[PDB]
Symmetry: D3
């Protein structure tokens, strides 16, 4: 029987450590595909397909976006994916950071390993592309961010965070688990690109609710901040912008190629990027897609400066 948890919100501080090395290495991460029911919005239970990071023998939590992977250019990257036994649909990986870096569909219970070399630096998206239906798998929340830093790592910053944006089309009733009163993917609404809710880090109120990481992204005044951003979509890009903030550096792919002083950057679906800004002003600031009516739909977050 399916697990039913409060939410799949991803902490935007659960980030691997900064890179200060030039020696290539074999970086290795353990992932587990987890089908879960949880609140998408307040009062709305949704059937999620998520990624969870396994450390040692311990696993979870299940989140949207998935766990942030972090490596250096020239490293060898090993992702062990497991498909939980209590899942329904099969799953697999697809890393934009690698050349032909896709796994083969693994059945619930089986576990396979994906090995690939990260030979192009940048922020990339990774996702579930199983059954040749990447649309359906991403739509349910199976997407995360991988960053390949250059040799020596990116310029050091005071605080760093991770945000994944996505849109959701909800149909009441789940085909499986009919006992559960909650929503399932809507093909029609999805095909028509007419979403109901927008989410930052897997929840409509995530980054807006103190209980659900509402004060999670907080920085001291005068700090340099870096933001690893993904647009999971699966259809709508993000006109990303933070109120009262100016992006000193913006690079979608390479550190060297960037625009200075961007206010709002269009991040297309299925793409990741890096934002850099100094927190020169104190107080609360609203993180939002600048398609503003999107914000009421949940494209709304909160940055704190002390």
């Amino acid at each position: 029987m399916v697990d039913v948890i409060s939410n799949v919100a991803k902490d935007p501080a659960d980030i691997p450590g900064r890179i200060s090395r030039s020696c290539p290495k074999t970086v290795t991460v353990n992932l587990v595909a987890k089908e879960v029911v949880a609140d998408l919005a307040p009062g709305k239970k949704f059937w999620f397909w998520t990624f969870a990071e396994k450390k040692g023998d311990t696993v979870g939590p299940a989140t949207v976006p998935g766990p942030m992977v972090r490596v250096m250019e020239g490293d060898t990257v090993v992702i062990n994916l497991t498909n939980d036994l209590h899942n329904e649909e099969p799953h697999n990986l697809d890393f934009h950071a690698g050349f032909g870096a896709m796994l083969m569909d693994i059945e619930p219970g089986e576990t396979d390993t994906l090995t690939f070399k990260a030979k192009r630096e940048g922020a990339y998206i990774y996702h579930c592309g199983a059954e040749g239906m990447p649309w359906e798998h991403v739509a349910y929340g199976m997407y995360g961010l991988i960053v390949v830093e250059p040799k020596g790592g990116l310029s050091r910053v005071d605080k760093e965070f991770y945000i994944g944006q996505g849109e959701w089309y909800i149909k009441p009733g789940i085909e499986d688990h009919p006992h559960i009163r909650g929503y399932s993917l809507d093909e029609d609404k999805a095909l028509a690109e007419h979403p109901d809710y927008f989410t930052f880090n897997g929840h409509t109120q995530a980054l807006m609710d103190p209980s659900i990481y509402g004060n999670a992204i907080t920085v001291n005044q005068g700090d340099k901040v870096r933001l690893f951003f993904v647009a999971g979509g699966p259809n709508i890009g993000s006109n990303f912008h933070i109120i009262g903030q100016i992006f000193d550096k913006f690079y979608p792919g390479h550190r060297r190629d960037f625009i200075r002083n961007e206010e709002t950057a269009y991040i297309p679906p299925g793409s990741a990027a890096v934002f850099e800004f100094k927190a020169l002003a104190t107080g609360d600031f609203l993180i939002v897609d600048h398609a503003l009516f999107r914000v009421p739909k949940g494209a709304g977050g909160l940055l704190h400066v002390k």
Copy 2:
């Protein structure tokens, strides 16, 4: 009782003077938030929320986009905002050009001053973000462009213009002023991102009608032209392009970071940018968003070369 004027179209030549100085200064502008009824489209009266520039004791006209602000990097910028006495909803400022450069909601009648230092160069958007509902306030037309030029100013050009694009969702009847037969904002159409009309400089026929600035943007052949462009949205970006024209320089944020020879540039909502092109061909040329069915809806302008 509400004022009812023909239109809120903004002259795309009402531009402050070019900057040729390196001495920082305290540049100061007087704004007044003005709720007005006027033609959005021919035969359609709409309830606008606009910005107007006050010179000396004289104010107006009320326009969309709002008045262009123009400063140098390192200047100190002072905006005195006034909320007219005959307004309904409260208002405030939000400048993308400044760090935590937001005012506090001022009530109809009261007047506050916003002081901020412009320490990042570029073209930025400013707007009304009052009542924590920037979507509603921008949707009614409360958006304008500010440019922070580098020290010495941008490279001199023969002719310069100012264009703000926006989309509108209209509901017949205004909740207030029921006597007026005209349209008010539609939450549903707005939330669904399905606009009825598109406008350049606050009117569907603005830049297309000789009476309403139709021949306003005219330049001599062989001239260098610069265009300060804003995408007010509040939801739809602009695939900006001018027929028979090639953009020699395009920079969304910094002068140094630009692409040469762009044909169509995506300007996301809540963003401003600078276009530069030589008028090497004579005659009439259609300024349009390149989502072409948008053009019938009003995303259509006119450039004249003599």
Copy 3:
């Protein structure tokens, strides 16, 4: 009476030869506007307005996107357009690569020549803008790509291809040719930006069907690949991305201005660009817009690496 052919799919290998010269020249191409009925999707006949390239006395085939034009910066470009006698609506050219490079509407039967100098390098779109209704003419498939290479030509690559993306709004019945059972343009669906099908190179299954250029784009492992890409629209841009591939170079307009290591690039409607990537991984790879539900609608292609 109208011609009725199986499809208007464009071979993504029918490309002019690479440029290795610095001597400017007068490059000349013969085009013929061809109204045709053909399969848009399997089982759906659509009324197309296309461009065809005339070599010597021989013409055709009629395709979407139109024939790729290819010149050097400083060349003199001569396009002879002919409007077939059995056409209905008038037509003309509009080249984004030239300054005021638009023809005048030519009637079915008449033939005019467009001469222009290509003095800005880059990948550009060209299209039919006749009757002052570029939306209607582009919507029916009258769009192609022109590239102006720098002097010496772009860096040489092993394999090169040409892809035009577009979206379609279909209404059953053609106003003309009522005898034909097939679909015509839908103003309403088009104005609302709610397309039914998406196409790569003029067909929903083109680049997916072995019969219809399905294995057309095939390259040997370790090859450098260049892709000339257009977004015909006429309303929807393309979040272009190829699965298992990383773009080493991406330039929308100038060769010099580009971003390294892009995964997904937003190509706005009415714009063309150049993608460059090494085929370091073997096997099949899905070419798609990353608005993934678009892929089921036909935004789906196939790249083969041996």
Copy 4:
């Protein structure tokens, strides 16, 4: 009767203040041409022609190289030159930092003003070019350094110093002042480019003797150091290098154009340049021209790191 002082050594710390402004200004300096007898080397009295800086009503000391002038690009530079009453030969100015920035020969007693605009940034040499014999006038020590910093000034550093290198050809006996037992310029040795002594800051032991600025150039470990360097010549350039030090930045003329990590830089006679290096190692370090036998001849200084 001539003045006879111990030495004309220039303190390499008597430097104007750093520039942190972008507002152009009229910077003004008062100079006085001073013929003096002093020790060139220990036990060798030489007849010097020097420049001295007049502050307020007070003047002196007389030094080689002359006083460092320091301005910003776009400033207006005013140099009042005075030729002392007890001088013999006439004198004038010649600034490499200005376009046609030469005075006219002023007679002993008379005083003229040189006004010029500094519209090209960089480190330049200035000198006495009177009587159309710049060789004779420079040979006697009439040379100094002027730097035109960019707007905003050069990047700030912890410690800054000023060094002028020169070579000397000495003939016993002065034509004038026969009573004095000391040396005068040797035409023959000078014409043959065979100097006897080399000097840093006007003395053979200057920068080597604690009494004569020997510990004058001292910096704390980990400090950033900037060095304003002139090669007075008048015939021999300087293969400038500091032992145990690496120049992180070296620019002869423009800040932007520089080589990173230079060990020894050739500074041609009649040229000035800027060296930048971090003092990462403690202890004493020998400043020298790398024509090493030059060092015994006096091309030898001392840098201290604590």
Copy 5:
């Protein structure tokens, strides 16, 4: 019997025409090696070995430096060298602009052709390297400048000039032509690098004497000036500098690689370079090597600004 002419001074305006083409071509020049007696200095007859340019059937004059060659990058360069019948020593060519671009020693009377492709842009020196003794042949004045401009040519300028610097060691008596009372090369003085005279364009007073090209280099105020400079040596480089002038651009080899705002540039012997400066100041200005005692020896020229 040997010819005896007044001087071998080269007009610094006898320059080929500017290049405004990108089409490679086969540029061809006819040279004739001419041994001549003439004034090196006033009252001093010297035995010169020079190059002369043959146009059509007409040849001469014989000059130092030799005739300026001027081509575009990618051209094919053909130099027909002739060794006059009344010469003594054999001669040949050696172009620094070409890969293995050396002729074979041609005997007096015989004529050979040198063909080479100019595939690296820049200013280069060419000279006589015959008998494996390039020192002896260059010492007598057999050196000239070749420039390979990029495709399109260098940026256009108002006025352009050509200057070759050299030093001379003179021995009274010529081994051949004993009847002539004049000077021949001195091995000892030459080997010891102790020259007697310095020359600009083959004469000590050339560029200083109105009769001998003294007012030859004259430009209008506000003009852009370009200078093609060679350092023939054969031993001493030139600390080139023009009084009252600042070099806006200086490139020894490639147009792209240059330093801005140089005052004095060291040009090593056997090297050529390009100087660029605006003539913003009127009047007379002294062109000189900044080894100033060199100027009395003849390293002295004259620039006029009106």
Copy 6:
């Protein structure tokens, strides 16, 4: 008693292996200071002070320039210097590649280790600076080249070589070893900068004599060649140039900062640099300082292309 060998010529192919790693390491080299008598020129025995590289238990040969050291930026460099027991004067190291990277004078017999971090990339000189008389120690031949390559190493080339230039002042008789008939350093000639011989790699005929490395530097046509060059001096720089060759890249200190297409580059004494060129022409080519009378004095080498 002193050793007496034929010559101290250094093989310009005895070069450490190319670097293809980014992992910092502790690179370690064993040096031994060796006083030796040998032929400077044919028939002239000179008293040399040289460096020799000790591999394992085996040492020698003794050469000028000393052994080439080769490391990566960020490595830790360990040089064990030994002063042979049969030496007279004490010795020490001085690396331009390190911050305060000087040893203390070690007595004949004693052995010390120099540890330093190479944190600035480039080609540098190292030498003996013992007894505070670097002039005397370098003059006798105690100088070599160290290169700090960037992470990943310099771009790979087909063939690589090592050349050290120097000048010599010789006095007959050695103060020590009076039995030996040969020459010792001349203070006077040295102080006056009037050298007798010039040498490439420690011998006048080295690189010119088949027996003494005359055909040592040989490369196949079409090969890319890199040259690590030092100017030991100790007084005269090198106007380095190779006949029939063009330097595609020239960097004195940093790989990034370089000039393209240099013909002759001035390398000041006490400096090292990197030259890069393609061997597009076959046959013999003369390597020389372009102060051509220097070539007869021994500044003459030989490059072979097959």
